[PDB]
Amino acid sequence: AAKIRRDDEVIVLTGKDKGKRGKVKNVLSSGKVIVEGINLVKKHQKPVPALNQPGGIVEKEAAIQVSNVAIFNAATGKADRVGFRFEDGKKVRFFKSNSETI
Amino acid sequence: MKKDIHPKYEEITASCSCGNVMKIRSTVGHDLNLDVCSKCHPFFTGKQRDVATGGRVDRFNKRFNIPGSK
Amino acid sequence: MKRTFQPSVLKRNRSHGFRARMATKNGRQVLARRRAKGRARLTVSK
Amino acid sequence: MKAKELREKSVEELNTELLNLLREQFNLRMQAASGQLQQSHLLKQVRRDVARVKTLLNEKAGA
Amino acid sequence: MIREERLLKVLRAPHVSEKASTAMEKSNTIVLKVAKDATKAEIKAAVQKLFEVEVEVVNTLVVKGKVKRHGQRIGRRSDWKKAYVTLKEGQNLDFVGGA
RNA sequence: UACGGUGCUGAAGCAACAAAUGCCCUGCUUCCAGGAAAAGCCUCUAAGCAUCAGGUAACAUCAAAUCGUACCCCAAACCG
RNA sequence: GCUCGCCGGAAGACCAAGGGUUCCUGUCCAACGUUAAUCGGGGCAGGGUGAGUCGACCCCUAAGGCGAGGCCGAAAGGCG
RNA sequence: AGGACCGAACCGACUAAUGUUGAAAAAUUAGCGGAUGACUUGUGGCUGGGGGUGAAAGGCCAAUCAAACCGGGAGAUAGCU
RNA sequence: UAAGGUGAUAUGAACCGUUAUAACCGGCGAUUUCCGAAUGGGGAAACCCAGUGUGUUUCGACACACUAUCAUUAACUGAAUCCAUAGGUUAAUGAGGCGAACCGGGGGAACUGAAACAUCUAAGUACCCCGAGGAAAAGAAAUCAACCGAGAUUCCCCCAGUAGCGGCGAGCGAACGGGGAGCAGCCCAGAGCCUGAAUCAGUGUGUGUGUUAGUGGAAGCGUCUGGAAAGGCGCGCGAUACAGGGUGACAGCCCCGUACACAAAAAUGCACAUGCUGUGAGCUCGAUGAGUAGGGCGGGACACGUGGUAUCCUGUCUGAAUAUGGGGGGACCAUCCUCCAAGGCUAAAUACUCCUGACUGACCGAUAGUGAACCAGUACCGUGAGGGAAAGGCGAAAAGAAC
């Protein structure tokens, strides 16, 4: 619903990973918006005694919800709210306040 | 039920023989039947005799027919 | 003496009879309080 | 094809296709028969359309 | 034979149970299960027009099989209801096994 | 042999003796507090059909109408 | 194995109070068997209890529900 | 023949004894009858407030009801520490 | 509109589909395993079987389609009774079915303030019972006064706590007299002339505008400390935006508001203009439905609780007279007065907030508040009738034992 549209490029700033930047993202209902997977040292589980025993410790669901930044491009995270105008006839795709759309 | 021309009556009140004494006087307990209607027979015709007392200007109908009207 | 609690279906009708509790105005109010207005269920209907 | 796709059709699936469209639930939906690498649960994800023809019949006769 | 009847909901899959081994010898006394709709008349009408295959006698069975999944003591019962149907003498499985 | 069991094969096969709870006995007796109707059992006809219809017989078949049937009792999932 | 028990008008039997699916087994220790715990309907993985004849439908009735029209009824209600 | 004399689980209620700091608002053990019916015996449906059936009770009748286990009157009366 | 989704609280795993029908929101339709309130008859809540059709079958069968009790009205039909009439076989159409409570109907106590309990206060309240709508009840006068006059009803402060009734007990407790709020009239009983002229019940259309989606919506960095600096300072900018609270804390500064500009299908608000099915519009000439009223002896409510006695009430019963007046004058009658002929209609003042909606909070911030934060009227007790809990609450990401 978010008119910023699922190829585009965001950053962490309102948590400790401050600057971790990446594109396309993962979007699902009340999903926590991982940027691109900002995790470093957090375990994985063993519900299988077979050979495949999940050995992970990296990328997994590092939360930083919605997006605190209108899509990076050079500097600045605003204005995010900004609705825009007729481009597709059944939706509208946006960038930020200063630069038409993308 | 009886006087039904003029509809119904059983009004629970007393008769004060020692001040405010609840002895229910007002309950009537007597019944009568049979008189001649406008057509042919000595019909069932219910009264106490009140209904038929009320007949001194009725022409078999102008009160008689309130139960029969609907 | 034979004390007390046990289950049966045929003793129900004049007391615990579910549709008898809709037929009396006595029952009707309590049912509606207990599960129509009061958030809840009964379901023990076999 | 989901039901709204074929509305040009003169007759509903009730003519024979109703059973040819329903039989699998007794013929293939037992253990690993309908599939195991490639199918499973069908009758919601894809195969629901048989049920639309039901209310649609009454729409068409009720007009 | 009719198509407007309770058949299309009255059945489930075949019941695959061991008794197909132990009692099918000179006849095919094969197991099924059936939905909440099942009076015997329905499943009697069923098999030959839904699975192409000719039968003789039919049994319906009130099975009441308790279950629990909620952790806390309880779950459900569902309709459950097994049945037994009768694939005659010798046409056994000779093209498919509907197991 | 799956150590449960079925796979092959297979005997022997009469007369009495004593006694029910039970069968015969809505038999048959003995006594009064005096043991409830429709019905299956079996026939009579009213009307009305009456060169039509009805039922009783040999044989061929069909339908055989939602249940419940798991553990449990002169007595622990009743109750206590 | 080997020596004997208890219920002895057996907790022998199948099935009726609707409690309802918690038997064989495959597996076990809290959600509990005031020792052990291997067993308790414990409690969890399968499944199950195959009724045209069993019996309550009926046709039906002695008790007693409801009941035309009613005799009455304060609204209630009662006796058919 | 008989509400026999003496007989079984279907009956109760005699004083103890291990019943009272309960196995039990009740029941008990080696003991003992009324031996066919002034017995009791169990699915239900009439008796639903100041009750209603009489071996005729002040016992009943939820287990201790001279009226409760009602909750609505009502957080009453209150010469009350 | 804008993209994801498969209503979840094991999510494994199938699989719609990010083109403009995947879901999902919304006008309006449409779905039945059977019950069903359920209604053929039966009823032990989930029903066990009547009685008659129809499309059609691999010709077994099959899914289905309807009726009842009443209240009124046309048709056919019908008894002991020539005749009357009841009563059936139907046709038509709706309510009977359901609510915490409001209000209309009546009933409704027991004991206890009174230091004694048969008045009465208790209480018109418990309930149970009958209505039928969103507003009522009412309301167009024998109403009130003194000859002044007022006008449906009564309402608001008074007068007044005045009159005024008593185990002379405790309570109940009036109208006038003044200011006002008010501020308007008629049809049958029926005939002539007149005649879609006034209203409104409907039901299509349409403007002026609603209901809500779709349209939207504010400003910041540098540094000293530093998990988050969203503190502090700088003011490097801001204001009819500085609610509360979100984002791991404390952000005017990022927010989600507020303030403001555009705006839909297709029913349908209300207001009006039209459209059409039905109504009544304008003027006269006519007309007046008494067992009702009396009262002697009953039961009563009124300010007047037992009495000389007061109506408008109610009941066995008896039983008048048309406005050339008497019905009654808060004792009773004068002088005199005012309603009015006993059919029927009325604008305002009032009250239920079913629930959801906008604002306020010397109000509850779980000793609690609508029984109610819950998913607690749910469960721990119950011949039970159903009395209802002990009870707020991990907290960047479930980041929930990698090793």
From Swiss-Prot, chain A:
Record function comment: One of two assembly initiator proteins, it binds directly to the 5'-end of the 23S rRNA, where it nucleates assembly of the 50S subunit. It is not thought to be involved in the functions of the mature 50S subunit in vitro.
Keyword Acetylation: no
Keyword terms of this UniProt record: Ribonucleoprotein, Ribosomal protein, RNA-binding, rRNA-binding
GO molecular function, one term: structural constituent of ribosome
Name the record gives this protein: Large ribosomal subunit protein uL24
Record family assignment: Belongs to the universal ribosomal protein uL24 family.
GO cellular component: cytoplasm; cytosol; cytosolic large ribosomal subunit
Quaternary structure, from the entry: Part of the 50S ribosomal subunit. Might contact the SecYEG translocation complex when it is docked with the ribosome.
One GO term of the biological process aspect: cytoplasmic translation
Pfam families: KOW (PF00467), ribosomal_L24 (PF17136)
The keyword rRNA-binding appears for this protein: yes
Organism: Escherichia coli (strain K12)
Residues making up the signal peptide according to the UniProt record: none
Swiss-Prot record, chain C:
Protein name, as recorded: Large ribosomal subunit protein bL34
InterPro entries named in the record: Ribosomal_bL34, Ribosomal_bL34_CS
Subunit structure: Part of the 50S ribosomal subunit.
Keyword presence, Cytoplasm: no
Family designation: Belongs to the bacterial ribosomal protein bL34 family.
Biological process terms in GO annotation: cytoplasmic translation
Annotated PROSITE patterns: RIBOSOMAL_L34
Classification via Pfam families: Ribosomal_L34 (PF00468)
Keywords: Ribonucleoprotein, Ribosomal protein
UniProt keyword Magnesium, yes or no: no
GO molecular function, one term: structural constituent of ribosome
Lineage, opening ranks: Bacteria, Pseudomonadati, Pseudomonadota, Gammaproteobacteria, Enterobacterales
A GO cellular-component term linked to this record: cytoplasm
Entries under Gene3D superfamilies matching the protein: 1.10.287.3980
Top-level taxon in the UniProt lineage: Bacteria
Gene name in the database record: rpmH
From Swiss-Prot, chain D:
Alphabetical UniProt keywords: Ribonucleoprotein, Ribosomal protein, RNA-binding, rRNA-binding
Phenotype when the gene is knocked out: Cells missing both S17 and L29 grow very slowly and have a rather unstable temperature-sensitive phenotype.
InterPro entries: Ribosomal_protein_uL29 (IPR050063), Ribosomal_uL29 (IPR001854), Ribosomal_uL29_CS (IPR018254), Ribosomal_uL29_sf (IPR036049)
Entry keyword rRNA-binding: yes
One Pfam family of this chain: Ribosomal_L29
SUPFAM superfamilies linked to this entry: Ribosomal protein L29 (L29p) (SSF46561)
GO molecular function: rRNA binding; structural constituent of ribosome
GO BP annotations, alphabetical order: cytoplasmic translation; ribosomal large subunit assembly
Domain of life: Bacteria
Entry's Gene Ontology cellular component terms: cytoplasm; cytosolic large ribosomal subunit
Purpose: Binds 23S rRNA. It is not essential for growth.
Quaternary structure note: Part of the 50s ribosomal subunit. Contacts protein L23, trigger factor and protein nascent chains. Might also contact SecE and probably does contact SecG when the SecYEG translocation complex is docked with the ribosome.
Similarity field: Belongs to the universal ribosomal protein uL29 family.
Protein name: Large ribosomal subunit protein uL29
UniProtKB/Swiss-Prot annotation, chain E:
Keywords attached to this entry: Ribonucleoprotein, Ribosomal protein, RNA-binding, rRNA-binding
Impact after mutating residue 52 to K: No effect on trigger factor binding
GO biological process assignments: cytoplasmic translation; ribosomal large subunit assembly
Gene3D superfamilies reported in the protein's UniProt record: 3.30.70.330
GO cellular component: cytoplasm; cytosolic large ribosomal subunit
Keyword set includes Metal-binding: no
Ribonucleoprotein keyword on record: yes
GO MF annotation terms: rRNA binding; structural constituent of ribosome
Entry superkingdom: Bacteria
Similarity remark: Belongs to the universal ribosomal protein uL23 family.
Subunit: Part of the 50S ribosomal subunit. Contacts protein L29 and trigger factor. Might also contact SecE and probably does contact SecG and SecY when the SecYEG translocation complex is docked with the ribosome.
Function (record text): One of the early assembly proteins, it binds 23S rRNA; is essential for growth. One of the proteins that surround the polypeptide exit tunnel on the outside of the subunit. Acts as the docking site for trigger factor for Ffh binding to the ribosome (SRP54) and to nascent polypeptide chains.
Protein name: Large ribosomal subunit protein uL23
Organism of origin: Escherichia coli (strain K12)
The organism's taxonomic lineage, starting at the top: Bacteria, Pseudomonadati, Pseudomonadota, Gammaproteobacteria, Enterobacterales
